[PDB]
Design an enzyme around this catalytic site. Sequence first.
Site, PDB file in Angstrom:
ATOM      1  N   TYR B  51      38.148  59.172  47.049  1.00 36.76           N
ATOM      2  CA  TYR B  51      36.840  58.509  47.119  1.00 36.76           C
ATOM      3  C   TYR B  51      35.880  59.143  46.126  1.00 36.76           C
ATOM      4  O   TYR B  51      35.716  60.363  46.101  1.00 36.76           O
ATOM      5  CB  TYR B  51      36.243  58.547  48.533  1.00 36.76           C
ATOM      6  CG  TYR B  51      36.164  57.173  49.158  1.00 36.76           C
ATOM      7  CD1 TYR B  51      35.292  56.201  48.649  1.00 36.76           C
ATOM      8  CD2 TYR B  51      36.968  56.833  50.243  1.00 36.76           C
ATOM      9  CE1 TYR B  51      35.232  54.920  49.212  1.00 36.76           C
ATOM     10  CE2 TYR B  51      36.917  55.562  50.809  1.00 36.76           C
ATOM     11  CZ  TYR B  51      36.050  54.613  50.289  1.00 36.76           C
ATOM     12  OH  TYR B  51      36.013  53.364  50.847  1.00 36.76           O
ATOM     13  N   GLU B  53      32.570  57.412  45.209  1.00 34.85           N
ATOM     14  CA  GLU B  53      31.315  56.653  45.180  1.00 34.85           C
ATOM     15  C   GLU B  53      30.269  57.431  44.393  1.00 34.85           C
ATOM     16  O   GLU B  53      30.154  58.650  44.539  1.00 34.85           O
ATOM     17  CB  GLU B  53      30.794  56.415  46.590  1.00 34.85           C
ATOM     18  CG  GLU B  53      31.620  55.459  47.419  1.00 34.85           C
ATOM     19  CD  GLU B  53      31.248  55.522  48.878  1.00 34.85           C
ATOM     20  OE1 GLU B  53      31.163  56.640  49.418  1.00 34.85           O
ATOM     21  OE2 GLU B  53      31.039  54.459  49.487  1.00 34.85           O
ATOM     22  N   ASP B 197      29.751  37.331  27.916  1.00 39.25           N
ATOM     23  CA  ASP B 197      30.977  37.554  28.671  1.00 39.25           C
ATOM     24  C   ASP B 197      32.136  37.454  27.680  1.00 39.25           C
ATOM     25  O   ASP B 197      32.603  36.357  27.352  1.00 39.25           O
ATOM     26  CB  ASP B 197      31.100  36.511  29.789  1.00 39.25           C
ATOM     27  CG  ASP B 197      32.297  36.747  30.706  1.00 39.25           C
ATOM     28  OD1 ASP B 197      33.182  37.575  30.380  1.00 39.25           O
ATOM     29  OD2 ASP B 197      32.355  36.074  31.762  1.00 39.25           O
ATOM     30  N   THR B 223      36.623  41.673  31.037  1.00 44.46           N
ATOM     31  CA  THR B 223      37.806  42.169  31.714  1.00 44.46           C
ATOM     32  C   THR B 223      38.362  43.314  30.857  1.00 44.46           C
ATOM     33  O   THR B 223      38.123  43.374  29.651  1.00 44.46           O
ATOM     34  CB  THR B 223      38.864  41.061  31.840  1.00 44.46           C
ATOM     35  OG1 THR B 223      39.037  40.428  30.563  1.00 44.46           O
ATOM     36  CG2 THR B 223      38.420  40.011  32.853  1.00 44.46           C
ATOM     37  N   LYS B 226      43.592  41.108  29.459  1.00 43.33           N
ATOM     38  CA  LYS B 226      43.514  39.999  28.472  1.00 43.33           C
ATOM     39  C   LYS B 226      43.786  40.543  27.052  1.00 43.33           C
ATOM     40  O   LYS B 226      44.726  41.327  26.886  1.00 43.33           O
ATOM     41  CB  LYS B 226      42.231  39.140  28.613  1.00 43.33           C
ATOM     42  CG  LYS B 226      42.036  38.578  30.040  1.00 43.33           C
ATOM     43  CD  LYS B 226      40.943  37.511  30.144  1.00 43.33           C
ATOM     44  CE  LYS B 226      40.723  37.089  31.608  1.00 43.33           C
ATOM     45  NZ  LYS B 226      39.523  36.207  31.768  1.00 43.33           N
ATOM     46  N   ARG B 232      44.237  45.519  35.068  1.00 42.64           N
ATOM     47  CA  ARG B 232      43.385  44.475  35.633  1.00 42.64           C
ATOM     48  C   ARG B 232      42.086  45.081  36.194  1.00 42.64           C
ATOM     49  O   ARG B 232      42.114  45.959  37.057  1.00 42.64           O
ATOM     50  CB  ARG B 232      44.167  43.710  36.699  1.00 42.64           C
ATOM     51  CG  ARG B 232      43.656  42.311  36.997  1.00 42.64           C
ATOM     52  CD  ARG B 232      44.768  41.459  37.639  1.00 42.64           C
ATOM     53  NE  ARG B 232      45.777  41.066  36.654  1.00 42.64           N
ATOM     54  CZ  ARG B 232      45.710  39.967  35.904  1.00 42.64           C
ATOM     55  NH1 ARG B 232      44.684  39.129  36.031  1.00 42.64           N
ATOM     56  NH2 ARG B 232      46.666  39.694  35.027  1.00 42.64           N
TER      57      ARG B 232
HETATM   58  C1  LIG Z   1      39.005  36.177  33.010  1.00 46.21           C
HETATM   59  C2  LIG Z   1      37.503  36.006  32.949  1.00 46.21           C
HETATM   60  C3  LIG Z   1      36.650  36.377  34.013  1.00 46.21           C
HETATM   61  C4  LIG Z   1      37.137  36.918  35.329  1.00 46.21           C
HETATM   62  O1  LIG Z   1      37.880  38.138  35.437  1.00 46.21           O
HETATM   63  P1  LIG Z   1      38.671  38.472  36.801  1.00 46.21           P
HETATM   64  O2  LIG Z   1      39.192  39.822  36.505  1.00 46.21           O
HETATM   65  O3  LIG Z   1      39.711  37.414  36.873  1.00 46.21           O
HETATM   66  O4  LIG Z   1      37.666  38.400  37.896  1.00 46.21           O
HETATM   67  C5  LIG Z   1      35.273  36.212  33.899  1.00 46.21           C
HETATM   68  N1  LIG Z   1      34.727  35.701  32.743  1.00 46.21           N
HETATM   69  C6  LIG Z   1      35.537  35.325  31.687  1.00 46.21           C
HETATM   70  C7  LIG Z   1      34.921  34.756  30.434  1.00 46.21           C
HETATM   71  C8  LIG Z   1      36.923  35.471  31.784  1.00 46.21           C
HETATM   72  O5  LIG Z   1      37.625  35.132  30.825  1.00 46.21           O
HETATM   73  C1  LIG Z   2      34.917  52.441  53.605  1.00 46.40           C
HETATM   74  C2  LIG Z   2      34.176  51.297  54.261  1.00 46.40           C
HETATM   75  C3  LIG Z   2      33.732  50.165  53.540  1.00 46.40           C
HETATM   76  C4  LIG Z   2      33.890  50.002  52.054  1.00 46.40           C
HETATM   77  O1  LIG Z   2      35.170  49.968  51.410  1.00 46.40           O
HETATM   78  P1  LIG Z   2      35.264  50.153  49.812  1.00 46.40           P
HETATM   79  O2  LIG Z   2      36.710  49.958  49.586  1.00 46.40           O
HETATM   80  O3  LIG Z   2      34.790  51.543  49.590  1.00 46.40           O
HETATM   81  O4  LIG Z   2      34.378  49.116  49.217  1.00 46.40           O
HETATM   82  C5  LIG Z   2      33.068  49.132  54.194  1.00 46.40           C
HETATM   83  N1  LIG Z   2      32.850  49.195  55.553  1.00 46.40           N
HETATM   84  C6  LIG Z   2      33.270  50.292  56.283  1.00 46.40           C
HETATM   85  C7  LIG Z   2      33.011  50.348  57.768  1.00 46.40           C
HETATM   86  C8  LIG Z   2      33.929  51.346  55.645  1.00 46.40           C
HETATM   87  O5  LIG Z   2      34.297  52.312  56.320  1.00 46.40           O
END
Ligand SMILES: *Cc1c(COP(=O)(O)O)cnc(C)c1O
Ligand SMILES: *Cc1c(COP(=O)(O)O)cnc(C)c1O
Lengths: 405, 405
Positions: B51, B53, B197, B223, B226, B232
Site C-alpha cells: 500500500y 497511498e 488525450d 494510456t 497502445k 495496461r
Molecule cells: C484507449 C483510450 C482510452 C481509455 O483507456 P483505458 O485504459 O481503456 O481506460 C481513453 N482515451 C483514448 C483516446 C483512448 O484511446
Molecule cells: C481499502 C479499502 C478501499 C479502497 O481500495 P483501493 O483498492 O485502495 O482503492 C475502499 N473501501 C474500504 C472499506 C477499504 O478498506
Amino acid sequence: MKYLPQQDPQVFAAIEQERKRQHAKIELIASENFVSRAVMEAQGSVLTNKYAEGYPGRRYYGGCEYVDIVEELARERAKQLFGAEHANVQPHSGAQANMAVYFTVLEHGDTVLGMNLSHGGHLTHGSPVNFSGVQYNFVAYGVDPETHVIDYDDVREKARLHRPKLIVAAAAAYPRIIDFAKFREIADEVGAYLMVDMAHIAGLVAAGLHPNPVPYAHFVTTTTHKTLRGPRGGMILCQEQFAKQIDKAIFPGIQGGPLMHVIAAKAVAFGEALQDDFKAYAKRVVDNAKRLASALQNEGFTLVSGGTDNHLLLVDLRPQQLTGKTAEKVLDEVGITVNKNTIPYDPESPFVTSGIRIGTAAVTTRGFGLEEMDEIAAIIGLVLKNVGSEQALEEARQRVAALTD
Amino acid sequence: MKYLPQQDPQVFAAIEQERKRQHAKIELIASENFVSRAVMEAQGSVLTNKYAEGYPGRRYYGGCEYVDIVEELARERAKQLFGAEHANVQPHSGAQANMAVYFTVLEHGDTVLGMNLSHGGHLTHGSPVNFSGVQYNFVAYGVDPETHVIDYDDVREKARLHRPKLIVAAAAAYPRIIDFAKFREIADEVGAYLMVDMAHIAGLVAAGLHPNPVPYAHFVTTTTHKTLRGPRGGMILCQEQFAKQIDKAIFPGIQGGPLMHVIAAKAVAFGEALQDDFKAYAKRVVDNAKRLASALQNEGFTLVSGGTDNHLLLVDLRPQQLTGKTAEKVLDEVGITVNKNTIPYDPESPFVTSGIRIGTAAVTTRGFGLEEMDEIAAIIGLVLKNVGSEQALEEARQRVAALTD
Ligand SMILES: *Cc1c(COP(=O)(O)O)cnc(C)c1O
Ligand SMILES: *Cc1c(COP(=O)(O)O)cnc(C)c1O
C-alpha cells in the site's frame, strides 16, 4: 526474474530492495498481505496485451474466447465463495468498485449515510476531498463513546432524519463484527439501498468467520487484496436484479478496458480461498488478532472497543501520553510497520491521531502464531514505554530480527 | 511459469490458450500491442503487496522508500520522454486519467467540447452512457465530410457558441496528425483549458513522429499501453502550475492505493521508449501504416481521409456494399483481428458501422515490415471481395498462417 535485471537495472534494484524489506520487517498494517507466487505469475502474464471491453460473450473486440474463460472463472468462483447471485470482477480497485455502485443508484447530490470517517469509515465513504463527498451529500453515523461499537440507534436516527438514498456499512478501522441485518432493517424502514463495503473483512467472510453481508445488502463492494489475499483490485457482488445496471456502471460507465491479467490473478486468489487451508489460515488470522489484543492489554495498552472480533485492533495511546504519529515513527525505527489511526472521538487531527491500527493478516501468512503474537506485543510494550532509550530500541530491533530471521 | 500450472490448472490452461492465440493471429486492432518480458516481470513482482497511498516522500504509510524510487523513476522518465513539467503515473487506466483531469477543472454540469464520437472521439469524451456525458455537458466538433480531417473552423464555432470550460483534443480512430497549436489558439480565444488525450499516439509522440501536445495543452492524458507499448494503465502530464491539483485529483480524489507493480512496469516501458531502438520501431509503425494504406488502396479499398499520418487507418466499406460488422466477422474466420468502426457521417449504427479500423503497432512489434503489409492488404482484398467463397477463405487462412509461422 530473468529479463528485468538485464533490461532495467534501476527498476530491478528497487524491486529487490522492496522484496528484502517485505521479509525483514514485521508488517502489522491491517490492510496488507502477501500474495502467492501463482497470483503474481497470473498478473505477470501476456493477458496484459488483450483489450476486452465489455463482458464474457458480449465483448466489443474479437479474440476474447480465452480471457472470457478467465473472467468467468473469476465470477463463478467469487459467487461460490460468497454465495452471491452476480459478480463483477472488473473494478480496478476498491475505490472504483464503490464509485461504480454510487454511479448505479445515485444522482449528483443525493444523500448517503456512511460511518463517521474518524470512527472507522473509509475515505470513499464521504471524505470532502474524495469524489464521494464532493459528488454526493454524505452524512455520518457514529460509534458509542464508551464501547466504540456502532450505535445502531444513531444509524437509525440519522437515516430517519436525513432520508438517504443509500446507506453504507463497512469500515477501514473497525475491530468488531458489523450487524448487517440491523443495517438492512434500518435501510428498509427509510426505503434506502444498503451497500456493504467489506474490503477489510472479505477473507474472513469467505472463511465463515464474519457474518456474510451478501444476503442483507443490495450491493457488496470489496478489494480483492487485504484479508482475501488476492491481487490489488476491486469487485462488486449483487443480486441478479442489479446485475445489468452494475455491469453497465463499470463499463461503459466508469472504466474502459479491464485488466485481464489482474482478473486472472483474481481467479487464482478465489481458487485459493475456496480451499480448506484458506479457512484454517483465516481462523489463525482471527485467533492471532485476539491473542495479540490480549497480550497488548497484558502490557498495559488500552484497545478501542476493548478488543477485537476480526483481523484488526486499534490501540488508544492516550494513557501513555503518546500520539499515533509518535508511535508509528518509533516502531518504524525498530522494524515494526503500523499506521497511525484516529480513534473514536480523537482529540487529535487525522494527521497526528491518538492511535495505531494493527492487523494480523500479513504476519499470519508468514506463518506467525500465538507465541509470536505474545512477542510482538512485548516488543511494542518495550518500545512505547521506552521511546527515549536507544538501548531499548536496539533490543527491540534485535527481537524483531529474531522473529523474521 | 512455475507455480501457476500446479496451483490452478484451469487458469493456466486459459492463459496458455491466449498466449498461443496471440502468436497465431494477425493482430490489427489499432489499440493493441505486445509488451516486453521485462514489463511483464515488473508487474508480476511483489510490489502488488505494498500500500502506497499518497506520493513519493509524502505517503500515508511507512516502508515506501523503495516503491518511491520506482514511482520517481516512472515520473522522471515520463518527463524526459515527453518534455513535461509534471507526471502522474498513478492512474489505473486511460479512463481514470481522463476522469482525474475532469475532476480537477470541472464542476458537475460544466460544458466540455470534444471530438464527435462517430468521427473518431473516445467514449470518455462525452458518451451519454459514460460518466463523462452524464456528469458534464458535452458538445462535439466534427471532421470535414469530404476530407475527414478535423474542421478547425467547426472547433472554433462550437467553442465560441457553447463557451466550454474545457476543450478535448485526441481520438480513438483518427488517422491524421492533430494540430494542437490550433486547438490551443481556439482554447485561448474562449478562455477554456485544453486537454489532449494522446492515448493512441503516445508512442509516436515519444519517438518524435507526431507533434507533441505537451507544449500546447494544460493537461495531457494517455494510456501507458497502445503505441507506447507499456503495461495496461494511465498517466497524466501537465505543467508545474497544475501538479498539486492533478495529484490531489488522483488521490484522494478519484483513486485509492496505486498499483505499484504496474507503476514499476510503466517505468520499464518508459525506459524502453527512451532507447534509440524504440524510435526505429515507431518509424516502422508509421512506415508500415502508410504502406498498408497504399496497398489497401491498390486492392480497391477506400480509406477515411484518403490515407494515414500515424499508426492507424479506417477502411470505408461502402463501395464494397459491406458493413464493418460483416468484415470484422469474416476476417475473424481467417485469423485477422480487426474491429468494426464508425466512419464519419456513417449511415449505420455504431453497432453495425460502415468501416473497419486497422493499426500496425502490434504486427510491427512482431517484426512485420513492408512486404508483410503488402501481403496483409492482399489477404484482406481476397477475403472481402470473396465473402461467400469458402475456398477463398481457406486460402486466406493458409496465407495468414504463413505470415505468423
Ligand atoms: C484507449 C483510450 C482510452 C481509455 O483507456 P483505458 O485504459 O481503456 O481506460 C481513453 N482515451 C483514448 C483516446 C483512448 O484511446
Ligand atoms: C481499502 C479499502 C478501499 C479502497 O481500495 P483501493 O483498492 O485502495 O482503492 C475502499 N473501501 C474500504 C472499506 C477499504 O478498506
